[PDB]
Homo-oligomer: A and B are copies of this chain.
Amino acid sequence: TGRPEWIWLALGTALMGLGTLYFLVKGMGVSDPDAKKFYAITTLVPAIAFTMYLSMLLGYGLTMVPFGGEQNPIYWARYADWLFTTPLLLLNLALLVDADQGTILALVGADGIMIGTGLVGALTKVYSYRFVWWAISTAAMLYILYVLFNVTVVLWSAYPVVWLIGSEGAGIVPLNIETLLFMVLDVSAKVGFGLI
């Protein structure tokens, strides 16, 4: 079909489904309560991402916010997916370092302004302001990364970079490739980090 990045969306869908299937199959037997918590969180993330990728694939989680004299396609379902998977991720990270609820709520709270503000950046029609939201979102990311303190850092910090050179940002790489880099980013975070 006519949308260059459909194949990256299609690859994304496939890899998220499969990994869900995989963590689902792998969850059985888990009776240890704690272990069940880890498993449920690890299974749910790609599940969610699977439905989000399918919606973008299907062209539903996509919309054309105008800016820079341009009518631009924006996959708002990306943010929809990060809104729910990133705090769960942190839930997992919180069990590792065994973080208090105090730490947890600020971590999860900083996380929501993060994706909430990038989605606002995503959807603003006044190009100049997009980066203000981008910087406020990036500033919340560093809070999280900072309380969270080696691969989450590099993995999470790459989203703001691809956004910035992305076609939602400076516009340095076409959408077809920005989509590509997010997919690779989402699969490693949703599936590999869960595998790892």
List residues of chain A with CB under 8 Å of any chain B CB: 30, 33-37, 39-41, 43-44, 47-48, 51, 54-55, 58, 60, 84, 88, 100-103, 105-106, 109-110, 112-113, 116-117, 120, 123-124, 126, 129, 132, 136
Cβ of A76 to closest chain B Cβ, rounded Å: 13
**Residue pair B102, A44 in contact (C-beta under 8 Å):** no
**Residue pair B124, A44 in contact (C-beta under 8 Å):** no
Known: A106-B43, A126-B58. A100 touches B37 (CB 8 A): yes
**Residue pair B102, A36 in contact (C-beta under 8 Å):** yes
Given contacts A41-B105, A47-B109, A58-B129, 11 further A-B contacts (CB under 8 A): A33-B102, A36-B103, A36-B106, A37-B101, A40-B102, A40-B105, A48-B109, A51-B117, A51-B120, A58-B132, A84-B112
Cβ of A120: which chain B residues have Cβ within 8 Å of it? 51, 55, 60
Cβ of A31 to closest chain B Cβ, rounded Å: 10
Closest 4 A/B residue pairs (Cβ): A36-B102, A40-B106, A37-B102, A44-B109
**Residue pair B124, A60 in contact (C-beta under 8 Å):** yes
Cβ of A48: which chain B residues have Cβ within 8 Å of it? 109, 113
**Closest chain B residue to A39 by CB distance?**
B102
| A34 to B101 CA separation, bound complex (whole angstroms) | 9
